From a paper:
For rotaviruses (RVs), which are the major causative agents of life-threatening gastroenteritis in children under the age of 5 years and result in 453,000 deaths worldwide annually, recognition of specific cellular glycans for initial cell attachment is mediated by the distally located VP8* domain of the spike protein VP4. Although structurally conserved with a galectin-like fold, sequence-wise VP8* is the least conserved among RV structural proteins contributing to a phylogeny consisting of 37 [P] genotypes9. Our crystallographic analyses provide the structural basis to explain the unique glycan specificity exhibited by a neonate-specific bovine-human reassortant RV strain and its parental bovine strain, each belonging to the P genotype. We have shown that P VP8* exhibits a novel glycan-binding site that adapts to a differential recognition of precursor glycans, which are the core elements of HBGA and human/bovine milk glycans.
To understand how the genotypic sequence variations alter the structure and influence the glycan specificity in the neonate-specific P HRV, we determined the crystal structure of VP8* of a P human neonatal RV strain N155 isolated from a neonate with severe gastrointestinal disease in India28. As in other VP8* structures, the P HRV VP8* adopts a galectin-like fold with two twisted antiparallel β-sheets consisting of strands A, L, C, D, G, H and M, B, I, J, K, respectively. The two β-sheets are separated by a distinct cleft, which constitutes the glycan-binding site in the VP8* of ARVs and P HRV. This cleft is noticeably wider in the P HRV VP8* than that in the ARV VP8* structures or the P VP8*; however, the width is similar to that observed in the VP8* of the globally dominant P and P HRVs. Consistent with its distinct glycan-binding profile, the structure-based sequence alignment of representative VP8*s shows that the residues at the known Sia or A-HBGA-binding site are altered significantly in P HRV N155. For instance, R101 in the VP8*s of ARV and P HRV, which is critical for glycan binding, is altered to a phenylalanine, whereas the conserved Y188 and Y189 are replaced by glycine and threonine, respectively, in the P HRV VP8*. In addition to these amino acid changes, which may impact glycan specificity, there are significant structural alterations in the P HRV VP8* structure, particularly in the I-J and J-K loops, which may also influence glycan specificity. A distinguishing feature of the P VP8* is that glycan binding occurs in a previously uncharacterized binding pocket and the binding cleft is noticeably wider. Based on the currently available VP8* structures, a structure-based analysis of the VP8* sequences indicates that the wider cleft strongly correlates with a deletion at position 135, and a significant change at position 101, which is a conserved arginine residue contributing to glycan interactions in the VP8*s with a narrow cleft27.
Numbering used by the authors: 65 to 225
The structure:
Amino acid sequence: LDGPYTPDSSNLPSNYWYLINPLNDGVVFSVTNNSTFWMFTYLILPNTAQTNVTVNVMNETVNISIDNSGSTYRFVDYFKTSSTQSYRQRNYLITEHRLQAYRRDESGNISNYWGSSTYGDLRVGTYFNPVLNAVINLNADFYIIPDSQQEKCTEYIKGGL
């Protein structure tokens, strides 16, 4: 819709969907308030055997295991809620397209798509962990779709550009 825009980090406005279309796998999204929420999304390519990988995200070194082995992409969310904690895997998106999208509401809650494009179980999920006014890192090219057109965003997630 509006875009494409190059990767960027900033205090993104609320009530917009940022539809990311990543050139690269790995970390494509991240945000933290450095207090009670750290979140990133890792893009796993198709046919990825089980691998332990080390990434640098928001000034921390992180070790995670990734597995796909499917024909489809997997966008996997990770989060932790205290500094000394390790990140744990949470929800994920299985999809034949290089698309995931993020929205922050007026309370600071991050939403993104969970489930799949393939299986008929696509959901708008929310992590009820406010990070209002935190910088959001979009490590991907992206489009911007207003909340009023949320239905259109879902169509791209499910169907591709």
